[PDB]
Design a protein around this motif. Structure first.
Motif, short mmCIF file in Angstrom:
data_model
loop_
_atom_site.label_atom_id
_atom_site.label_comp_id
_atom_site.label_asym_id
_atom_site.label_seq_id
_atom_site.Cartn_x
_atom_site.Cartn_y
_atom_site.Cartn_z
N UNK A 186 44.09 36.99 42.31
CA UNK A 186 42.78 36.86 41.69
C UNK A 186 42.25 38.22 41.25
N UNK A 239 32.91 37.42 41.74
CA UNK A 239 33.09 35.99 42.02
C UNK A 239 32.22 35.52 43.18
N UNK A 273 44.25 39.49 38.21
CA UNK A 273 43.84 38.76 37.02
C UNK A 273 42.48 39.24 36.50
N UNK A 274 41.51 39.32 37.41
CA UNK A 274 40.17 39.77 37.06
C UNK A 274 40.15 41.17 36.47
N UNK A 297 36.06 33.89 36.38
CA UNK A 297 36.41 35.30 36.33
C UNK A 297 35.20 36.21 36.50
N UNK A 298 34.00 35.62 36.45
CA UNK A 298 32.77 36.40 36.52
C UNK A 298 32.71 37.21 37.81
N UNK A 299 32.44 38.51 37.65
CA UNK A 299 32.50 39.47 38.74
C UNK A 299 31.12 39.97 39.13
#
Ligand SMILES: *[C@@H]1O[C@H](CO)[C@@H](O)[C@H](O)[C@H]1NC(C)=O
Lengths: 51, 51
Positions: B47, A5, B50-51, A1-3
């Motif tokens: 995605x 990605x 969700x994020x 989930x780290x943004x």
């Protein structure tokens, strides 16, 4: 989930590796196209009879 | 009395966020105030959602 990605490079290579596979199996001839769907399969058409 | 509420506006949605802000102006009150955090995303992307 780290943004944001970040995907690994190797993934694409593994993908191509999987999609380029052609093997013989219980489903008959197994091969895939660029998108990953099945190609060149054989679906036996069957009918239910008395016996 | 700060109320944090998240929000998700699809990229290309303008009049919607406009009406959102207009709503923020009209329904604002002395008792409490909504503190929106707006996030634009690709709404069709799971995605991203969700994020
Ligand atoms: C394999 O699939 C391709 C894609 O339609 C087709 O052109 C080709 O004739 C197929 N081969 C056989 C043996 O059915």
């Amino acid at each position: 989930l780290a943004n944001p990605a970040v995907p690994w490079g190797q993934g694409v290579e593994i993908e191509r590796a999987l999609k380029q596979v052609q093997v013989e199996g219980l489903s008959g001839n197994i091969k895939f196209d660029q998108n990953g769907k099945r190609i060149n399969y054989t679906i036996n058409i069957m009918e239910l009879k008395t016996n | 009395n700060s109320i944090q509420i998240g929000g998700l506006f699809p990229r290309g949605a303008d009049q919607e966020y406009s009406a959102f802000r207009v709503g923020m102006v009209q329904f604002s009150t002395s008792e409490f105030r909504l503190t929106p955090h707006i996030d634009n995303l690709e709404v069709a992307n799971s995605f991203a959602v969700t994020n």
